[PDB]
Structure 1
């Protein structure tokens, strides 16, 4: 159930937010901002993501005029956590 609880969480947390129907039945990336603020991994401001989060906030706001998909939900939270190569900094 390790990955099971992972996939469910990504979708169910999206369900919780107030754009699940009203927006595009999905949310603009500007709303994803507030989401990653908390439910990413609490904070994370001290490792490396501190750079990427800021760069994300730029791209998030600019690009996400259309919508943010669950594919990008993963993208943003994974890229702030990585953004270098891949698993080089973690495995």
Structure 2
């Protein structure tokens, strides 16, 4: 059944809405939410997580850093997985 997938969506919503609630209106991820996320990321994983900070910042900041859209966050989920070179190109 869809249940496992729906559970995964459930978790994703679970995470995202904590940010999006903080004025991420129209289902967005705003500058505020970004700086909070960045701060939270900037902790005890200061190589991998920082490479992820750079990748996040770059991937999301197609100028729209002010108000990045949920679909771009989804695309970033894509971009993370896409590090599986060849299989997902790179």
Bin of the TM-score, shorter chain as denominator length: 0.5 to 0.7
RMSD: 3.9
Match of 2:12 among 10, 13, 28: 10
Question: Which one scores higher on RCO, CA 8 angstroms, separation ≥ 6?
Answer: 1
Higher strand share: 2
> How far off is 1:86 after superposition?
5.2
- The structure that has the greater radius of gyration is 2
Q: For structure 2, list consecutive stretches of 5 or more residues without a partner in the other structure.
A: none
Runs of 5+ unmatched residues, structure 1: none
Number of equivalences: 81
Q: TM-score, normalised by structure 2?
A: 0.52
TM-score by length of 1: 0.52
Tell me which protein shows more helix as a share of its residues: 2
